[PDB]
Design a protein around this nucleic acid. Structure first.
Ligand SMILES: C[C@@H]1C[C@@H]([C@H](O)CC2CC(=O)NC(=O)C2)C(=O)[C@@H](C)C1
Ligand SMILES: [Mg+2]
Ligand SMILES: [Mg+2]
Ligand SMILES: [Mg+2]
Ligand SMILES: [Mg+2]
Ligand SMILES: [Mg+2]
Ligand SMILES: [Mg+2]
Ligand SMILES: [Mg+2]
Ligand SMILES: [Mg+2]
Ligand SMILES: [Mg+2]
Ligand SMILES: [Mg+2]
Ligand SMILES: [Mg+2]
Ligand SMILES: [Mg+2]
Ligand SMILES: [Mg+2]
Ligand SMILES: [Mg+2]
Ligand SMILES: [Mg+2]
Ligand SMILES: [Mg+2]
Ligand SMILES: [Mg+2]
Ligand SMILES: [Mg+2]
Ligand SMILES: [Mg+2]
Ligand SMILES: [Mg+2]
Ligand SMILES: [Mg+2]
Ligand SMILES: [Mg+2]
Ligand SMILES: [Mg+2]
Ligand SMILES: [Mg+2]
Ligand SMILES: [Mg+2]
Ligand SMILES: [Mg+2]
Ligand SMILES: [Mg+2]
Ligand SMILES: [Mg+2]
Ligand SMILES: [Mg+2]
Ligand SMILES: [Mg+2]
Ligand SMILES: [Mg+2]
Ligand SMILES: [Mg+2]
Ligand SMILES: [Mg+2]
Ligand SMILES: [Mg+2]
Ligand SMILES: [Mg+2]
Ligand SMILES: [Mg+2]
Ligand SMILES: [Mg+2]
Ligand SMILES: [Mg+2]
Ligand SMILES: [Mg+2]
Ligand SMILES: [Mg+2]
Ligand SMILES: [Mg+2]
Ligand SMILES: [Mg+2]
Ligand SMILES: [Mg+2]
Ligand SMILES: [Mg+2]
Ligand SMILES: [Mg+2]
Ligand SMILES: [Mg+2]
Lengths: 159, 64, 182, 105, 148, 106
RNA sequence: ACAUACGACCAUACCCACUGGAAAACUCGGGAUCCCGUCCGCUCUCCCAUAGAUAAGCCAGUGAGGGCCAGACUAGUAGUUGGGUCGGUGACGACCAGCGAAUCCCUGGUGUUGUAUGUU
RNA sequence: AGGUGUCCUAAGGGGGGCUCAUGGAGAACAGAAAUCUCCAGUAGAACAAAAGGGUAAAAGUCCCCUUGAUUUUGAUUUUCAGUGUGAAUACAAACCAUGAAAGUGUGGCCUAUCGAUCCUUUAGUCCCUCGAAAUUUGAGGCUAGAGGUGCCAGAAAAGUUACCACAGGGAUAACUGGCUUGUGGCGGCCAAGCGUUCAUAGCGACGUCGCUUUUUGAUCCUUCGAUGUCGGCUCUUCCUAUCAUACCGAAGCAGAAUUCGGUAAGCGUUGGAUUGUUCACCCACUAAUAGGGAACGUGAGCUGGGUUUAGACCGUCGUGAGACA
RNA sequence: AGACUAAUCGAACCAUCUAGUAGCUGGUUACCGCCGAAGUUUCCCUCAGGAUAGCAGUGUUGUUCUUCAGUUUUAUGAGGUAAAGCGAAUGAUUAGGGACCAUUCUCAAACUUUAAAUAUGUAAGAAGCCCUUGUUACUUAAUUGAACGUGGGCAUUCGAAUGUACCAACACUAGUGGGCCAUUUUUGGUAAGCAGAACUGGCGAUGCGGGAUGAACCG
RNA sequence: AGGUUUUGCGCGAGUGUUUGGGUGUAAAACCCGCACGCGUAAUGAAAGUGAACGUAGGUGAGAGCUUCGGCGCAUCAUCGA
């Protein structure tokens, strides 16, 4: 609109939480990123060098280039009627590995273990995840707890 | 004569008429724009690997 | 009413040649029968290429035939198009080429080398299914017009300029000394 | 804006190719050859009965000019230009600032 | 709206009085909850499944709507999964079998008629509040008789 | 009024060109009349040849000097060497060119 | 298990007050030629490791301590997505299919852990 | 609700030491404010300049050394057509700065602080051209800056027309109509007080709920190939929120006069001086001299006083042509 | 008097340049079949117009074990709105009490310790995973790593559901660039059949049954 | 008239007779050839220079063919020369 520069509307997005501002934990610098990793961008306002625009804050992408203290990220930006490849140079201070990819990577390793174990044992196993299924028949015992009869309560109390 | 200033009405319906398509990615992404040190070395790494495969296929090498 | 997004959508591919060539009509009739009454996927492709226009059947040279014919010798080269002669090829080996057209120079040199310069109706006689055939296509994107398609900033395409010189498109948007570069 | 008379910067003089001490002055636009091709062409167009033939800039918005420094190498003896930002009251005197000094009324 | 439009396309309900069979686990349950203002659903019984397929059951053969008048169509299309007759097809639908996805997708969506006698004064309300939309649990059989 | 990816026009048609359009419908008629004129000239000139003898000259630029063509007339140096008076050659069908000069013996 | 050096999470670890601390370590400590830096050997720097001390730092325990952390209640409440030719003059509200918070009062807890070297 | 067209050789770069605003206690002049000491002090200070983020052995403050505010072109981001301009990010190759070092530095902690073609000028190119040949001036070229377009993707630009003209617009004003009712007008609810005492005979403040379209606003839906634009005269009819007349209720109704209210619009509601006047203000009569509507009823019904072309005068304004609810 | 100068005068009449220019008004000629919009982005002495991109048609081609999705599930992020809070920071604010302290009533578009619903990014594999080993001028103290591979092993249960009644790309070009209405949210205004926005659906471009009647309402 | 994209056609590293000449049943038809236009080489402001390390390269996909082990057109992506 009237003012359309960078950092416009980032009063809360680029700030820091109430009691965790000040010094930046050093575990961020000790994480190691390879090409092909999937990372989440979360701009830290305490470091004003090498930020990413507010559109990419909270987005996720694939690392494509690794340089000294920053990495390149390929992010698909929706621009009206199409998506556009966007290559973002963002410092390792503004990113973190995505746990969704890690959860997938523990699953792909696990699927190999069950398939290897099943083939050696000699029975087939299911690898695909299955959504929640309708409940089967079950019997409920009332030997300890019996049903409690509850009825709607009167308006009674005005306050 | 004043007019209507802006409108995002009908802009989402216009976009989805031909879908919002992501561009297709090939197996080998472009290495232009990567680190120059890595990029120069990768040129030599591929050149040597091609030579090694050629020698192994021809017969001068038996390690591939 | 039914919730459909498209109605009466037509096939995007040509189903019959636009040519009024009576001889080409006979050729299509032969390959309509062959493609229908045989399990040869080669016949279907040859039938489809007979429909195509002239920009989709670029000419091929004997040199490009020779380049691809190794070690595919003892196979019949099939080109649905025109086979042209190459001056830069000093000698022509013995080849078997079946094509819609042969230039007079190309037909003479192939036959002089001791090879076969046959048509597609002759090909359907001894090879009704493309038993030992090499189906080859000319360079599609080698046309001058394709050099202009998709012109835009940072596209490295050929502009529509009526002359070549230091003028007419060399100053602004072509070098940083005059404004900017593209 | 205060700039020192000397500064050590890169000299691309084909003989130094490194940081050398430079003499810093202020670039004044020279003027003006009367036989420049633009001046010859303009004079002939103006001559005759047409009147005034080319635009004359009347408006004005800028109150400043970018200061361009001429840096002269102490060894190669070749020059180098280095523009600055827009400013008023530029000086090369180099009367250094004093911190913690008493104000004078 | 666009989101309910997409779900009705994914459930193959492109017309009014169009019926499909759906196995509910969790993903299909959350899809149907969105499009409740447009659909009525329930739990069919053996007669409902059997009479639907015999009378209004057509197959999807080479993207064509082909009437199931003899077992040859079912054998030549669903034969790979052990379904070779109408009874096999009906059994795979009523009892949710391993090849329910292929059997259900083989059936063209059922093109039912308007109910005879129905529906009621206000049709586009939830079945709980005197309407038709939503989950009439076991009452879909009475509706199917009217519409089939 | 440029609208698309066009080539910028160069049509010099802004000077009331329609008054000076020359259409050559008499191309066939002029050719027939030229042949009639040629036949009349040959009949009057018989038995002399209808044209005159001309020398071989080399074309005058680096692009065309590789080729020779017919010149206007024989130079005075050529005529004197051949043993023909300058004012006799025109009477016997030889073209004379006093302006031309010979810088080479070949 | 305890101590020390370097850490990780960065208050369950912080702030105030009281009490206690075997072995070793940490510390306070003694001196000002050289290195070094100050208005001042206060800090920093260098030398001593003998003398003295757990007074302080440090650690531990205590406090119906302040705070912090977690739970319960608040509450199926506030709010909100979709629906009706629902109610109401209206402001607004109920219902159907779903999602679903946050205070005040109340209760419990008061660091966990890694590498390396040692400890009676 | 505010800001920019600037400012800085440091307020840029590196390194080291320290902790700020404030409060308490204490010391000669000295006090509420001078300087010195201790304790507490999560930033409540400072960071050129608006505001918002950010920062504590610092990004603040003091000290030491410097010019990375340099050279070479590329890749990427924001505005985006994924064009330009501005600004920004991450690398690479030099030459440097700082520190013991890891490292950091390509101007200002981050978000604004700015500019094409042509032309001129400067720096560099030991460079290329002046086309019959050669030298030297001169001129033209290539790469990078500057000179500026603030209407800031960049024309070189004063008025008046009441003498006026054309193409159009109801995309757009002036007159009716349409929605709205602030404003105007009218009507209710409560009850502090006024009324000799007594809230409610008659009023009713502070509040608050409405109705009408007879005022004026607001808007711009219809009309710009035109709906003749004020008032008056004449004439008809309609509304009630009733001035008079009919019949009644109430009174701070003894009579007379008067005030409030109910049914009720059947029937009336004037003659004049001044003003074009609507309105107003007087004189006089009268039972009374009520309020409104019908395209602000009514110009192929009138009149033309005003308004509302062209002539002319005055005052103010303008150098002037000319302007003036 | 801008008066008169052949019914012509704030510059006569006649012929020509001349078919002067017009982003403005009007008109624009048979039938059927198929597909079928926009009043939006950026720039413009731009605001009654253009260029540009978007929406559309046609012609194709690679192909036709083509691939994906206005969708749900599972896993995992971002946000600072509704609500809530003030015996918590900032700001506003009522009252008493004890010697500033402990309390008390009411608030915040440009306040906040907290914090939803709806929407929103990514992943759910063959371009994948494991073992050995090869190349390099990059990196490491280092044949340690990084990137790309040879040779082996995992098979169509190849690693959620549903659908595929949308495979992908290209060329050329039209019209459009005045919009309007409604549920929900929301700004200026006393309000408006007022002016201006967000998502979605409609009318324009659309007939049909109902709302007597009506561009938007219901079916 | 000059462009551009697409369709049909002829020739094809060439292509185009018709400025002109010969001839003619006479503004037709037929024949002829030199130059020239476009293309075959680009890039620089210019002086100028001027396109193979290699089966005209490697990797992945790829219709089709297959002697079933493989070869793989066009085209796209990528690393090179
Ligand atoms: C104002 C002055 C002149 C200006 C320039 O000569 C104006 C030109 C622009 C061009 O398009 N042709 C025009 O006729 C004049 C230049 O750029 C400025 C820095 C300094
Ligand atoms: Mg945040
Ligand atoms: Mg910076
Ligand atoms: Mg508009
Ligand atoms: Mg139909
Ligand atoms: Mg003169
Ligand atoms: Mg009946
Ligand atoms: Mg520091
Ligand atoms: Mg930019
Ligand atoms: Mg550096
Ligand atoms: Mg600073
Ligand atoms: Mg110049
Ligand atoms: Mg400039
Ligand atoms: Mg502009
Ligand atoms: Mg004028
Ligand atoms: Mg006028
Ligand atoms: Mg006027
Ligand atoms: Mg008005
Ligand atoms: Mg009112
Ligand atoms: Mg109006
Ligand atoms: Mg209007
Ligand atoms: Mg009008
Ligand atoms: Mg009219
Ligand atoms: Mg009228
Ligand atoms: Mg009444
Ligand atoms: Mg009125
Ligand atoms: Mg009348
Ligand atoms: Mg007058
Ligand atoms: Mg005067
Ligand atoms: Mg006036
Ligand atoms: Mg006058
Ligand atoms: Mg007259
Ligand atoms: Mg005319
Ligand atoms: Mg302009
Ligand atoms: Mg119009
Ligand atoms: Mg367009
Ligand atoms: Mg906000
Ligand atoms: Mg709130
Ligand atoms: Mg709260
Ligand atoms: Mg507060
Ligand atoms: Mg999610
Ligand atoms: Mg357009
Ligand atoms: Mg229209
Ligand atoms: Mg409709
Ligand atoms: Mg010729
Ligand atoms: Mg030629
Ligand atoms: Mg290649």
């Amino acid at each position: 609109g009237h003012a359309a520069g960078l950092r416009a509307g980032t009063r809360y997005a680029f700030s820091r939480n109430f009691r965790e501002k000040g010094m930046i934990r050093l575990s961020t610098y000790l994480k190691q990123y390879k090409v092909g990793d999937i990372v989440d961008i979360k701009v830290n306002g305490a470091v004003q060098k090498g930020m990413a625009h507010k559109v990419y804050h909270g987005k996720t992408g694939v690392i494509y280039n690794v340089t000294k203290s920053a990495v390149g990220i390929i992010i698909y930006k929706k621009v009206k009627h199409r998506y556009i490849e966007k290559r973002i140079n963002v410092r390792i201070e503004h990113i973190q590995p995505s746990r969704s990819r890690d959860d997938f990577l523990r699953r792909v390793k696990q699927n190999a273990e069950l398939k290897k174990q099943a083939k050696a044992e000699g029975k087939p196993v299911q690898l695909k995840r299955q959504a929640l299924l309708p409940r089967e028949a079950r019997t409920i015992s009332v030997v300890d707890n019996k049903p409690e009869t509850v009825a709607p309560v009167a308006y009674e109390t005005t306050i | 004569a004043k007019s209507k200033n802006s409108s995002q009405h009908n802009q989402s319906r216009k976009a989805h008429r031909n879908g919002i398509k992501k561009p297709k990615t090939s197996r080998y992404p472009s290495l232009k724009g990567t680190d120059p040190k890595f990029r120069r070395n990768h040129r030599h790494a591929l050149h040597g690997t091609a030579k090694a495969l050629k020698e192994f296929k021809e017969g001068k090498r038996e390690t591939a | 009413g039914i919730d459909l997004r498209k109605h009466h959508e037509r096939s995007t591919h040509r189903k019959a040649p636009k040519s009024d060539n009576v001889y080409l009509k006979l050729l299509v009739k032969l390959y309509r029968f062959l493609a229908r009454r045989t399990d040869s996927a080669f016949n279907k492709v040859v039938l489809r290429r007979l429909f195509m226009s002239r920009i989709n059947r670029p000419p091929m040279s004997i040199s490009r035939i020779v380049a691809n014919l190794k070690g595919n010798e003892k196979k019949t080269v099939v080109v649905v198009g025109t086979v042209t002669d190459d001056n830069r090829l000093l000698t022509v080996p013995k080849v078997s080429v079946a094509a819609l057209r042969f230039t007079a120079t190309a037909r003479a040199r192939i036959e002089a080398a001791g090879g076969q310069a046959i048509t597609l109706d002759q090909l359907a006689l001894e090879k009704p299914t493309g038993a030992n055939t090499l189906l080859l296509r000319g360079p599609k994107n080698a046309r001058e017009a394709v050099k202009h398609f998709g012109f835009g900033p940072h596209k490295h395409k050929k502009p529509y300029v009526a002359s070549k010189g230091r003028k007419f498109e060399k100053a602004r948007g072509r070098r940083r000394s005059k404004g900017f570069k593209v | 804006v205060n700039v020192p008379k000397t500064r050590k910067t890169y000299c691309a003089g084909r003989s130094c190719g490194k940081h050398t001490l430079h003499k810093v002055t202020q670039y004044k636009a020279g003027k003006a050859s009367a036989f420049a091709q633009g001046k010859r062409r303009y004079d002939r167009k103006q001559s005759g009965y047409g009147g005034q033939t080319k635009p004359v800039f009347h408006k004005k918005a800028k109150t400043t000019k970018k200061v361009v420094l001429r840096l002269e190498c102490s060894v190669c003896k070749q020059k180098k230009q280095l523009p600055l930002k827009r400013c008023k009251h530029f000086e090369l005197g180099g009367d250094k600032k004093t911190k913690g000094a008493a104000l004078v009324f | 709206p666009p989101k309910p439009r997409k779900i009705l396309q994914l459930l193959r309900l492109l017309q009014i009085n169009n019926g499909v069979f759906v196995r509910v686990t969790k993903a299909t349950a959350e899809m149907i909850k969105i499009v409740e203002p447009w659909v009525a659903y329930g739990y069919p019984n053996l007669k409902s499944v059997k009479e639907l397929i015999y009378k209004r059951g057509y197959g999807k053969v080479n993207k064509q709507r082909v009437a199931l008048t003899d077992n040859s169509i079912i054998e030549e299309n669903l034969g790979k999964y052990g379904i070779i007759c109408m009874e096999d097809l009906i059994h795979e639908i009523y009892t949710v079998g391993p090849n329910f996805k292929q059997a259900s997708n083989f059936l063209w969506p059922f093109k039912l008629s308007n109910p005879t006698g129905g529906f009621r004064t206000r049709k586009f309300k939830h079945f709980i509040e005197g309407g038709d939309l939503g989950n009439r649990e076991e009452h879909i059989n009475a509706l199917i008789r009217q519409m089939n | 009024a440029i609208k698309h990816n066009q080539q910028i026009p160069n049509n010099h048609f802004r000077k009331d060109w329609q008054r000076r359009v020359r259409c050559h419908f008499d191309q066939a008629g002029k050719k027939a009349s030229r042949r009639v004129a040629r036949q009349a000239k040959a009949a009057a000139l018989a038995p002399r040849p209808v044209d005159k003898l001309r020398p071989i000259v080399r074309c005058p630029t680096i692009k065309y000097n590789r080729r020779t063509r017919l010149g206007r007339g024989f130079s005075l140096a050529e005529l004197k060497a051949a043993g023909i008076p300058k004012l006799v050659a025109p009477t016997i069908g030889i073209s004379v060119d006093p302006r031309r000069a010979n810088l080479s013996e070949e």
